[PDB]
Amino acid sequence: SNAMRNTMRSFILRARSAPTDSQRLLDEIGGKCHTEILAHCMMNSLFTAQSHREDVVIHLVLESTRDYSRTITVEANEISGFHEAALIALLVKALDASVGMGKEQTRVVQPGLTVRTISFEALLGELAEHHSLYMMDKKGDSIRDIKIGPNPCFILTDHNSMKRLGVEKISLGPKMLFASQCVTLIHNEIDHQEAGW
């Protein structure tokens, strides 16, 4: 193996129960669709105590729709608080800007915030090229026992087409965890591997 330099970390939250409708989104906070998890995932994936993390991208694929899913891409680099309402707000903003889009389309919302009518599977297609793709599997190999690829990208669900795309299964531990908790764990293991300890 090579001595890696620090690379982009990406995450994909497949929120299949999540409304693409701006208002039905704020409605599901604490509701059966559990819309808080998106905000926590955003928090954990982009923020530490001191700073925001450099070079992180989260893709939120909001699926529950009358037409196309909205893929909301947040980039820690250009996104100039971390509580549930403020991050959920970033979403509503991007959702409002997506209304009336047709298929296979892209709309800049603000610096480092984009919305796209791209399928989950199509999006994987694009990331599959130059990213190391990973998914969660209680029966996958412990993450502490693999060498995490460069430009890694982690599929988290709010819950073989995959094997074709080179998607490798990993596990973070014995227990079932919130997607938001998976984020912190992933980040931490790459922080270790990068630091060498």
Place this chain on the structure above:
Amino acid sequence: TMRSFILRARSAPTDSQRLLDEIGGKCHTEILAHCMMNSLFTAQSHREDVVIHLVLESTRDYSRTITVEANEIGFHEAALIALLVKALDASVGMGKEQTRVVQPGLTVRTISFEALLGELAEHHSLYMMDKKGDSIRDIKIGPNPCFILTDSMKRLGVEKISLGPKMLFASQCVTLIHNEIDHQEAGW
């Protein structure tokens, strides 16, 4: 075994209203809820045998300690924050060194941070976040551990640990602490 956490929420108001006003405020009240959610809940269900003590310090008089016990007690910010508001409201009028039961597995106390440490030091293995501390991965977590989390110590016998190279939110530290005990106990 038992797992415990203490969160010294210095500058977290003991008043109910001022707490709600701090959701995303100068003092970030949201992190109390997140600490609770991560210490008490997994995706499958609540955790067994977990206790969290929240020490709220921004007080007129005495600070309030809210102990939540996983065995006894929505997971979103407003639900767990509501638990706290109920607890602080149970605390109005309390004297120094008092205890008041809010509901099964919810308790409010007018005991100090160090006063609580002193008690816990009797039986718990005390631990502290320190970027210079041993890596949690290299030590064997002691029996009945308690993890101090910020927003004399050496005398009480608390020993320093680091979860990694970076500076995390208290709530992120809870996740990584649980996950390490989870590993050591399943023999991973």
